[PDB]
């Protein structure tokens, strides 16, 4: 395998606006095929990148900043990863979704709002070339990536991901580590061929001869871990507090992160922004699309090399020599200035402070069937993507969604537009539910841990539990989506439209 901790962690440059005034900020980002070296010992890898970069440039905005991004497809007319046409026009379709964005529906990146190179062809829900992000939302770690119908797992794996940070000036007084000491960590697993080329499976292991070729697979587990586009990198840090914006940008893989010197993380934020109170953690789980906003305090570890370690398997136990490792910190950089940053306990209002009447309670079930080829097709509430819309909350109202998971695994459930509160999780009798559809609980409800007492938008629903969340649908109305954020599930076919009605 590739030798760990030999390349420095790249820090994506912050995107500069094409125009900027007090009233408006305007950016242009072009998707390009490009080559980048992912490890000291590899030939350059052919990739798809926003502005030809992997990851894409980091975009930083202020709360309420009036932002426009023209996202353009200048990709080749053919893909380089294996497309399975049996699961679902130009071959190469793209659309950018700002995940976590409180975004008008026609700038949200609907899967059928795709566009081919230079907008020559566009999907039936396409309305505009230049996306509008008003950013009228809490400070938080967002991220952007491709969301094209039936191609999301491939377009994202190709390299189309980047970070987007909203800064709320009202949080400045907290004096959290900032600027040079505030660093995104975009984690993506990949499998890389000897010649440096990306590998993505064209079929499951030992494909029945029934199977089409290529065939979609139900899960992707990469052999190698990359952070900010480099395989198992090191980062030289100063002996002081750092803030890290940790984003799982992987297709399937869930991570369970720790520090190998037994140091703590201080979680200050979740998907939807600052937690009410900081939380000291020795480890945390991070499923696809989740974000953790954390402080690591290197003050007491000068000289040390500390591995950000992973204990979660993907298709099997972790390998100590490979996917057990994420990156390495080296506490050897001289202090540029006194550490004047803080790690405050009191961060933000509780989500509970705000009282809301429950307009509706939906029960949703994670299910599926099997296709003519024998493959599993994963479905939300046994509906196809193309079935008439059933999730139709009213704008301005709050709902509890009760998500029933009788499957064998966790699924990270994501709703666009909104962030939400986690109410509780409760175990149930799976066999009974499958035979009769009757829900019998085998234990009391478990309220969220402190890490999930703030605002979330992507949430782990574990096997044999009912998960309840509370969301206020707004402030915009229109057509959005909800889906599993395991991309191999999302594309076949674990995604549904969501109408927020006025």
Cβ(33)–Cβ(47) under 8 Å?
Answer: yes
Cβ(346)–Cβ(277) under 8 Å?
Answer: yes
Which H or E element spans position 369?
strand 358-370
Which range, of 269-277, 346-354, 380-388, 414-422, touches Cu ion by CB under 5 A?
Answer: 414-422
Closest Cα to residue 182, out of 60, 278, 289? 60
Q: Please tell me whether residue 486 binds Cu ion under the rule CB under 5 A.
A: yes
Q: How far is 386 from 379, CA to CA, in rounded Å?
A: 11
Q: How far is 73 from 96, CA to CA, in rounded Å?
A: 10
Which range, of 75-83, 199-207, 300-308, 413-421, touches Cu ion by CB under 5 A?
Answer: 413-421
Which range, of 115-123, 171-179, 320-328, 407-415, touches Cu ion by CB under 5 A?
Answer: 407-415
Instruction: Pick the closer one to Cu ion by CB: 99 or 245.
Output: 99
Q: How far is the CB of 50 from Cu ion (least distance, A)?
A: 14
Pull the structure tokens for residue 188: 């993506």
386 marked ligand binding residue: no
Closest Cα to residue 179, out of 18, 57, 340? 340
Which range, of 38-46, 91-99, 130-138, 209-217, touches Cu ion by CB under 5 A?
Answer: 91-99
Instruction: Pick the closer one to Cu ion by CB: 241 or 253.
Output: 253
Q: How far is the CB of 465 from Cu ion (least distance, A)?
A: 14
Q: Please tell me whether residue 411 binds Cu ion under the rule CB under 5 A.
A: yes
For 83-107, the DSSP string reads P-GGG---S--B-EEEET----GGG
Instruction: Pick the closer one to Cu ion by CB: 289 or 331.
Output: 289
85 marked ligand binding residue: no
Cβ(378)–Cβ(484) under 8 Å?
Answer: yes
Which range, of 44-52, 82-90, 202-210, 410-418, touches Cu ion by CB under 5 A?
Answer: 410-418
Cβ(341)–Cβ(178) under 8 Å?
Answer: yes
Q: How far is the CB of 412 from Cu ion (least distance, A)?
A: 7
Q: How far is the CB of 100 from Cu ion (least distance, A)?
A: 7
What length does the chain have?
A: 502
Q: How far is 255 from 292, CA to CA, in rounded Å?
A: 12
Q: Please tell me whether residue 63 binds Cu ion under the rule CB under 5 A.
A: no
Cβ(82)–Cβ(200) under 8 Å?
Answer: yes
Torsion of CA 142, 484, 444, 433, to 10 degrees: 170
| Phi (first) and psi of residue 427, to 5 degrees | -75, 150
Residues 201-240 that bind Cu ion (CB under 5 A): none
Pull the structure tokens for residue 72: 């353009």
Q: How far is the CB of 164 from Cu ion (least distance, A)?
A: 11
147 marked ligand binding residue: yes
Which range, of 231-239, 240-248, 422-430, 487-495, touches Cu ion by CB under 5 A?
Answer: 487-495
31 marked ligand binding residue: no
462 marked ligand binding residue: no
Largest CA distance in the chain: 65
34 marked ligand binding residue: no
Residue in the shown chain whose Cβ atom is closest to Cu ion = 484
Q: Please tell me whether residue 484 binds Cu ion under the rule CB under 5 A.
A: yes
Q: How far is the CB of 173 from Cu ion (least distance, A)?
A: 30
Instruction: Pick the closer one to Cu ion by CB: 286 or 484.
Output: 484
355 marked ligand binding residue: no
Q: Tokens 């002081």 sit at which residue?
A: 240
Q: How far is 366 from 158, CA to CA, in rounded Å?
A: 28
What does the per-residue mask of binding to Cu ion show for 354-393, with x meaning CB under 5 A? ----------------------------------------
Residues 284-313 that bind Cu ion (CB under 5 A): 289
- Which residue among 4, 93, 190, 416 contacts Cu ion (CB under 5 A)? 416
In eight-state DSSP terms, residue 464 is: T
Q: How far is the CB of 150 from Cu ion (least distance, A)?
A: 13
Name every residue whose Cβ is closer than 8 Å to that of residue 340 and which is 6 or more positions away in sequence.
Answer: 175
Closest Cα to residue 84, out of 148, 151, 156? 151
483 marked ligand binding residue: yes
Q: How far is the CB of 489 from Cu ion (least distance, A)?
A: 3
Instruction: Pick the closer one to Cu ion by CB: 95 or 176.
Output: 95
Instruction: Pick the closer one to Cu ion by CB: 149 or 266.
Output: 149
Q: How far is the CB of 310 from Cu ion (least distance, A)?
A: 20
Q: How far is the CB of 160 from Cu ion (least distance, A)?
A: 11
Instruction: Pick the closer one to Cu ion by CB: 241 or 489.
Output: 489
Q: How far is 266 from 379, CA to CA, in rounded Å?
A: 37
485 marked ligand binding residue: yes
In what order do the strands lie in the sheet containing 59-62? 59-62, 161-167, 140-146, 96-99
Residues 93-152 that bind Cu ion (CB under 5 A): 99
Q: How far is 472 from 463, CA to CA, in rounded Å?
A: 26
Q: How far is the CB of 387 from Cu ion (least distance, A)?
A: 18
Which range, of 45-53, 244-252, 415-423, 438-446, touches Cu ion by CB under 5 A?
Answer: 415-423
Residue 432 forms beta bridges with which residues?
none
Cβ(414)–Cβ(484) under 8 Å?
Answer: yes
The binding site for Cu cation comprises 97, 99, 145, 147, 411, 414, 416, 483-485, 489, 494
Binding stretches for Cu ion (CB under 5 A): 99, 289, 411, 416, 484, 486, 489
The binding site comprises 97, 99, 145, 147, 411, 414, 416, 483-485, 489, 494
């Amino acid at each position: 395998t590739l030798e760990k901790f030999v390349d420095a962690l790249p820090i994506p440059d912050t995107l500069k606006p094409v125009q900027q005034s007090k009233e408006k900020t305007y950016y242009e980002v072009t998707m390009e095929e490009c080559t980048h070296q992912l490890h000291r010992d590899l030939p350059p890898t052919r990739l798809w990148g926003y502005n030809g970069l992997f990851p894409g440039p980091t975009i930083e905005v202020k709360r309420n900043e009036n932002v426009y991004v023209k996202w353009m497809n200048n990709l080749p007319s053919t893909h380089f990863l294996p497309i399975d046409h049996t699961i679902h026009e130009p071959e190469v379709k793209t659309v950018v979704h700002l995940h976590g964005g409180v975004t008008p529906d026609d700038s949200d990146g609907y899967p059928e709002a795709w566009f081919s190179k230079d907008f020559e062809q566009t999907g039936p829900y396409f309305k505009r070339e230049v996306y509008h992000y008003p950013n009228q939302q809490r400070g938080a770690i967002l991220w952007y990536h491709d969301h094209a119908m039936a191609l999301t797992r491939l377009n994202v794996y190709a390299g189309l991901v980047g970070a987007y940070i909203i800064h709320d000036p009202k949080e400045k007084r907290l004096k959290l580590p900032s600027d040079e000491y505030d660093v995104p960590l975009l984690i993506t697993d990949r499998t890389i061929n000897e010649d440096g080329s990306l590998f993505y499976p064209s079929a499951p292991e030992n494909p029945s001869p029934s199977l089409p070729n290529p065939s979609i697979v139900p899960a992707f587990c990469g052999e190698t871990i990359l952070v900010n586009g480099k395989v198992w990198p090191y980062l030289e840090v100063e002996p002081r507090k750092y803030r890290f914006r940790v984003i799982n940008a992987s297709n399937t893989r869930t991570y369970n992160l720790s520090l190998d010197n037994g140091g703590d993380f201080i979680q200050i934020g979740s998907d939807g922004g600052l937690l009410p109170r900081s939380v000291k953690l020795n480890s945390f789980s991070l499923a696809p699309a989740e974000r953790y906003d954390i402080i690591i305090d290197f003050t007491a570890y000068e000289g040390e090399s500390i591995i950000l370690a992973n204990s979660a398997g993907c298709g099997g136990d972790v390998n100590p020599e490979t996917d057990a490792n994420i990156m390495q910190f080296r506490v050897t950089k001289p202090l540029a200035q006194k550490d004047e940053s803080r790690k405050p306990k009191y961060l933000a209002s509780y989500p509970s402070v705000q009282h809301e009447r429950i307009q509706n309670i939906r029960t949703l079930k994670l299910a599926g069937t099997q296709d003519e080829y024998g493959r599993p097709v994963l479905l939300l509430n046994n509906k196809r993507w193309h079935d008439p819309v059933t999730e139709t909350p009213k704008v301005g109202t709050t709902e509890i969604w009760s998500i029933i998971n009788p499957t064998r695994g966790t699924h990270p459930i994501h709703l666009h537009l909104v962030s939400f509160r986690v109410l509780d999780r409760r175990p149930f009798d799976i066999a009974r539910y499958q035979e009769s559809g009757e829900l019998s609980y085998t234990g009391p409800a478990v309220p969220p841990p402190p890490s999930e007492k703030g605002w979330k938008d992507t949430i782990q629903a574990h096997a044999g539990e009912v998960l309840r969340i509370a969301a206020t649908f707004g402030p915009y109305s229109g057509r959005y989506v909800w889906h599993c954020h395991i991309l191999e599930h999302e594309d076949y076919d674990m995604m549904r439209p969501m109408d927020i009605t006025d």
